[PDB]
Amino acid sequence: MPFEVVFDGAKEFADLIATASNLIDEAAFKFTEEGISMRAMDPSRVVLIDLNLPESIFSKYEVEEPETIGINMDQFKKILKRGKAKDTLILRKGDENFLEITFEGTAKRTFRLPLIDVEELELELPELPFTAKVVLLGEVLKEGIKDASLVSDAIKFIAKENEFTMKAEGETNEVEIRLTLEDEGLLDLEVEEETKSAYGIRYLSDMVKGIGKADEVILRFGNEMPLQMEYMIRDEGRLTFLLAPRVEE
């Protein structure tokens, strides 16, 4: 139960947990000898967020025993609003339900909070054949989704051999973006067959606005199977969103 994690500057982790809170409120961080893990489902059982951070991310990391703790997303969002980019985040926990967040600098800050428990059921996602993989930049996808957000909500991604297309249909508007290997927004392609699927972009737009511009993304999808967008944190941690498309035309 007791642990201590010290890191000089955690604005990335702050905005990450802010996006997780905007996604869902009930979340439990499992602390194991390897690091931290979290898996948040959806109240409408349509979206799944997963994150893992090993012990090669923060500066100081001392854990006693692997367990599962819970932190309120509202109480955390009421905490990250004071995180300076040049601060030293220190998360301390003992045996009692007291969580300490410490910051060292021009004034020693220390906030104590109660620790409630979360009992969300965890189940391993079954393996599914992707048949479509691609690695792109985050800024291009973010600006495309922000340009196609106001016209409609169903954005259609089509992928063929060395070809990608992001389109936005409708009745009084149409948007189209082409992507090839010699373009300025595609890093690499691993397409297998001709796939095409339309997805909603509310949670998409929120989660891609929460992520910075220089970060990269890896999309895995198929014909009509759910999409998985993954990315890496400091080349050590992993974070993946997963959500199914719509059946309509």
Partner: protein, 1120 residues
């Protein structure tokens, strides 16, 4: 005595305030030159100010004070009809005035029903059958809640004036009775819920019995099946007349037969018919006979059944019966400990004991005071008892309410004890107070008790509770019943189960202690596994729990709580046996030389407009005068303009600010183009030769408030304003002006206001039997300089904790009301220093300075304002009142709270022109102040004073004999959004579950709310009435035309789907927690309705959404 001098000082201060107001109004900056709110001399003055005539006060006083109010009013109406003081018009006007005066006299002049609610009364003839008569009673708005008593009295006076005029009996036609019963059933089924469900035969008998027909007015736009009925001008619904007749005859039978016996008129035996129709409903122990009497008493069962009309039904606690305590008091109150540990009207009583519950630790404890209540108000496990709330006997309850079974109380117990010792040892004493030295000394010598202890016991038996040892010691001499406060509730157990209780007690550990030849005990240690703990916990006894004692569940009961259970059993000496038709107390009294009694037997159960500035559509929706001045737009209003004889300026203001005089009012014909002053209007008989229309002072024209605002700006001289809007519609007939300077001052003060025209703020009070300076926050020297020199018993005032009688002119008023009154006084002093330059009379600038002045209270349906003095305050969000300041007409008047106001506020901002022409709100207007309520000064002063803290031993002994509660002789002898609501409902369900030990069923009001919600939702969806956003008046048709042709924007629609979407989870959680039938169909129907109205478009490979609805649907599918 000195109360007359105090009232003289009060009226002297009132006259000083009146002289100040007169000196202020002497300048004449408002269209009014006389006092609008005069003080009433008596009921004669009240009725004269209500309807008059102005000068019949002498005859009214003579007749009343010489022959009684009833025949006095009868002869007064006779004289008014005969025209003794002269003539006043036609016979119809005579009848109208007589009816109004009679009703005002019998109602004491408090109700404005005959004033405005009943506008006109005419006589009309039947041109169809035989030429009989009907009263055309042109009613008005404020008559929908005229009151059942007032409606019955109006029917009585109408029949009386009909008998006086000598009219013919109307013939009830088939079409007439058909449309009457149709309107009745329509109002009962669709319009509004009724207070008394009528019957077809009953309403037919009534409509046939009424000699002359009655024709009311229009209420709503609801048609009938038989169109064009002869007699009525339309085919609308006469719901007003329906409710009038219903609450008049079908509800007020008791007062009706009382007034019948008072008057003596024939033709009313159908009320006796209705009484008859409602009248169509060796092994013998004393407690069994009492149970048989309670079973024969149908009133408690009928009340428990009728209590199902409100609140969640079928949620009664099985441990404790559905009733509170009965404390007989002259003429409800529940201990706030139960409210803190937690549905009807509430009333606080903190000076009594509380309930007893168990905590999370497993032990059982009772609630005593506020600190312990707030401490244990969160660690409760299950509610055992409800406490001991007080219901009295002086309540005016009718409809054959049977006698509630009383209880053996400590006061009655000690009274019987002292009477027994007086008749045995020949010792005189005075109970209910401190005893004399010699008497208390001889009593202490006879009873082996302390004299000071006996004094304290006689002073307060509940506070000074004797120890159980000495209690049993003194009981062994007289064989008196047991101590009630330390007597458990045993009236719900079987002797076969009591035998197992005595077996478990014998199989337990016991230690003894005796005191003064009383072989009592010292402690009992029991194991919770030795017997069924159901009744062991339902007994409601404070025990201590222990776990680490080699045994899982151990309980221990020490003194003075173990002797209270062991000594009634005789220290387990004699053997207990089970006997039917004999309660446990009966068996105990059988197998013992001491007879006991019973304890628990009583079971009874928008828009927020601020200023008056007519702008209409010229203001749009917000109607901001600052916005209008910035835009520089005109305004087409139907308003009254003025004209100055010297300057000549025209404007809707009262006084001309350019010059130093007040401008007069000009008259204009709206149809023609002529203008004439008041002199020409009164000379031309108020008729224009151009247009033959009555000369109206106001006209419809355009004005520019943008440039007209500079006048008010330079008049107020203060430009501190942030947000301020004007009125939109005018309800008055003349549509007179309003002081713009006073409106701007009110805006800068940032206070609220109603549509009445003055400043009044709501407050809630509740009278109590006593009064304490410690609680009201006033010092002894403060009361002395106020005028109090002695206590309720003649002793001087030196102690702050001096229990006193409830003073009449005292106010227990909350801090919010105090702050609002402070802001009102600030605005008042600001206006009186900026309007005329008058010195501040009150000079109030702090919270404590307001104590001493005079305010006015007013309830709905009360056209008279009760003048009270500001003596007191309050810390809690509620307050207390006086039984004279709060009467029955102020309690059952469609409102429990009352509005408070200041005298200067009324004197400065009151104007009859602020009253609508035909309709009216909850009240007409605070026309007249009243302060004299002399409660039999020279006749029954002892009756008025001696009301508190008396216990009738006679009725306490004669309560288990099925006495008649309507015994007037014995009565006189003894007298002599969503979050808060959802959380509250869930917490109420949870606490009910804790109390009933996790055993409940479904409710019915949830469906009674959902089904009408679903139907209304469907009707709104099929109607789809839209409204243009900026075009606020033009309602767009459901046929969509793209956009509003006058406003190229969106059109606001009435979706009404967000409420049901939030109510669905409530029913879902309810049906998931408890399983019930007859409603899964409704649940699946509403869910599928939402689904196919939207027609859940995305689904993953792993679904399995848990839903009890889908579970039950699949179960029914498999069963099919």
């Amino acid at each position: 005595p000195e109360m007359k001098a105090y009232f003289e000082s009060l009226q002297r201060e009132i006259d000083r305030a009146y002289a100040i107001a007169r000196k202020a109004r002497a300048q004449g900056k408002d269209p009014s030159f006389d006092v609008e709110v005069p003080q009433a001399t008596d009921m004669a003055g009240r009725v004269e100010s209500l309807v008059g005539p102005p000068g019949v006060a002498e005859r009214i006083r003579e007749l009343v004070k010489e022959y009684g109010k009833e025949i006095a009013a009868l002869k007064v109406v006779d004289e008014i009809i005969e025209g003794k003081f002269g003539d006043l018009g036609s016979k119809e006007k005579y009848a109208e005035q007589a009816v109004r005066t009679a009703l005002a006299i019998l109602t004491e002049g408090i109700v404005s029903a005959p004033l405005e609610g009943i506008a006109d009364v005419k006589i009309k003839r039947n041109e169809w059958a035989d030429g009989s008569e009907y009263l055309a009673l042109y009613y008005a708005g404020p008559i929908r809640s005229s009151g059942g008593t007032a409606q019955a009295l109006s029917v009585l006076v109408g029949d009386y004036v009909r008998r006086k005029l000598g009219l013919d009996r109307f013939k009830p036609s088939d079409e007439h009775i058909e449309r009457m019963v149709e309107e009745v059933d329509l109002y009962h089924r669709a319009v509004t819920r009724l207070q008394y469900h009528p019957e077809a035969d009953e309403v037919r008998l009534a409509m046939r019995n009424i000699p002359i027909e009655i024709t009311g007015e229009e209420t709503d736009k609801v048609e009938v099946s038989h169109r064009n009925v002869p007699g009525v001008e339309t085919n609308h619904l006469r719901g007003g007349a329906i409710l009038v007749l219903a609450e008049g005859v079908l509800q007020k039978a008791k007062k009706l037969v009382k007034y019948i016996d008072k008057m003596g008129i024939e033709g009313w035996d159908w009320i006796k018919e209705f009484v008859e129709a409602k009248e169509k409903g060796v092994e013998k122990g004393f407690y069994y006979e009492l149970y048989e009497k309670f079973r024969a008493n149908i009133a408690p069962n009928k009340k428990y059944t009728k209590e199902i009309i409100g609140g969640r039904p079928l949620f009664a606690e099985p441990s404790t019966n559905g009733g509170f305590r009965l404390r007989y008091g002259r003429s409800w109150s529940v201990n706030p400990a139960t409210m803190l540990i937690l549905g009807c009207i509430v009333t606080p009583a903190t000076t009594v004991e509380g309930p007893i519950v168990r905590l999370k630790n497993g032990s059982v404890v009772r609630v005593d005071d506020y600190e312990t209540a707030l401490k244990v108000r969160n660690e409760v496990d299950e509610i055992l008892y409800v406490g001991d709330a007080l219901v009295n006997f002086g309540d005016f309850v009718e409809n054959n309410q049977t006698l509630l079974p009383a209880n053996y109380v400590e006061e009655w117990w000690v009274q019987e004890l002292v009477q027994a010792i007086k008749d045995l040892y020949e010792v005189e004493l005075q109970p209910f107070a401190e005893n004399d030295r010699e008497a208390v000394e001889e009593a202490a010598e006879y009873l082996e008790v302390d004299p000071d202890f006996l004094w304290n016991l006689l002073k307060d038996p509940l506070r000074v509770k004797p120890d159980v040892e000495t209690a049993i010691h003194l009981s062994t001499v007289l064989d008196i019943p047991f101590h009630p406060y330390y007597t458990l509730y045993w009236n719900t157990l079987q002797p076969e189960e009591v035998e197992e209780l005595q077996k478990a007690l014998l199989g337990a550990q016991i230690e003894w202690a005796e005191f003064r030849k009383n072989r009592f005990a010292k402690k009992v240690v029991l194991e919770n596994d030795k017997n069924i703990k159901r009744y062991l916990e339902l007994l409601g006894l404070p025990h201590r729990l222990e776990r680490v004692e080699k045994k899982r569940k151990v309980i221990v009961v020490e003194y003075p709580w173990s002797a209270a259970l062991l000594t009634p059993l005789g220290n387990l000496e004699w053997e207990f046996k089970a006997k039917p038709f004999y309660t446990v107390i009966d068996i105990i009294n059988e197998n013992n030389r001491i007879k006991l009694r019973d304890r628990g037997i009583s079971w009874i159960g928008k828009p927020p407009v601020q200023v008056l500035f007519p702008i209409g559509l010229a203001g749009g929706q917000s109607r901001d005068i600052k916005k209008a001045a910035e835009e520089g737009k005109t305004a087409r209003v139907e308003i009254a303009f003025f004209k100055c004889p010297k300057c000549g300026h025209v404007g809707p203001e009262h006084l001309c600010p350019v010059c130093g005089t007040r401008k007069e009012l000009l008259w204009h014909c709206p149809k023609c183009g002529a203008d004439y002053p008041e002199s020409d209007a009164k000379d031309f008989n108020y008729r224009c030769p151009k247009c033959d229309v009555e000369l109206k002072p106001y006209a419809e024209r355009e004005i520019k408030p943008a440039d007209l605002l500079r006048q008010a700006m330079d008049n107020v001289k203060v430009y501190g304003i942030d947000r301020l809007k004007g009125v939109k519609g005018m309800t008055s007939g003349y549509k007179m002006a309003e002081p713009l300077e006073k409106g701007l001052l009110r805006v800068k003060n940032d206070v609220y206001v109603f549509k009445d025209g003055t400043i009044r703020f709501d407050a809630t009070d509740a009278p109590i039997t006593h009064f304490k300076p410690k609680e009201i926050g006033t010092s002894v020297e403060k009361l002395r300089e106020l005028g109090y020199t002695h206590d309720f018993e003649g002793k001087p005032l030196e102690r702050d904790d001096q229990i006193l009688e409830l003073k009449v002119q005292d106010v227990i008023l909350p801090y919010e009301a105090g702050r609002y009154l402070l802001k009102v006084a600030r605005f008042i002093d600001d206006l009186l220093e900026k309007f005329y330059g008058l010195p501040r009379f009150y000079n109030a600038e702090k919270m404590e300075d307001l104590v001493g002045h005079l305010v006015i209270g007013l309830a709905p349906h009360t056209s008279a304002g009760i003048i009270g003095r500001i003596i007191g305050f309050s810390d809690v969000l509620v307050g207390y009142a006086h039984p004279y300041y709060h009467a029955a007409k102020r309690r059952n008047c469609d409102g429990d709270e009352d509005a408070v106001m200041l005298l200067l506020d009324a004197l400065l901002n009151f104007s009859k022109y602020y009253l609508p022409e035909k309709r009216g709100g909850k009240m007409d207007a605070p026309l007249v102040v009243t302060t004299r309520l002399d409660p039999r000064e020279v006749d029954s002063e002892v009756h008025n004073m001696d009301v508190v803290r008396y216990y009738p031993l006679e009725f306490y002994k004669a309560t288990y004999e099925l006495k008649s509660p309507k015994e007037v002789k014995v009565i006189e002898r003894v007298e002599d959004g969503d979050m808060e609501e959802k959380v509250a409902r869930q917490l109420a369900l949870a606490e009910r579950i804790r109390a009933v030990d996790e055993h409940h069923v479904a409710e019915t009001i949830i469906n009674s709310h959902l089904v009408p919600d679903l139907r209304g939702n469907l009707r709104s969806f099929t109607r789809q009435e839209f409204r243009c956003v900026k075009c606020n008046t033009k309602y767009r048709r459901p046929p969509l035309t793209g956009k509003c042709p006058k406003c190229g924007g969106k059109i606001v629609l009435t979706v009404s789907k967000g409420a049901i979407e939030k109510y669905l989870p409530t029913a879902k959680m309810l049906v998931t927690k408890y399983r019930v039938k007859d409603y899964t169909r409704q649940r699946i129907c509403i869910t599928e309705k939402d689904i196919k109205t939207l027609f859940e478009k995305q689904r993953t490979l792993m679904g399995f959404s848990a839903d009890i609805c889908e579970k039950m649907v699949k179960e029914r599918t498999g069963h099919s």
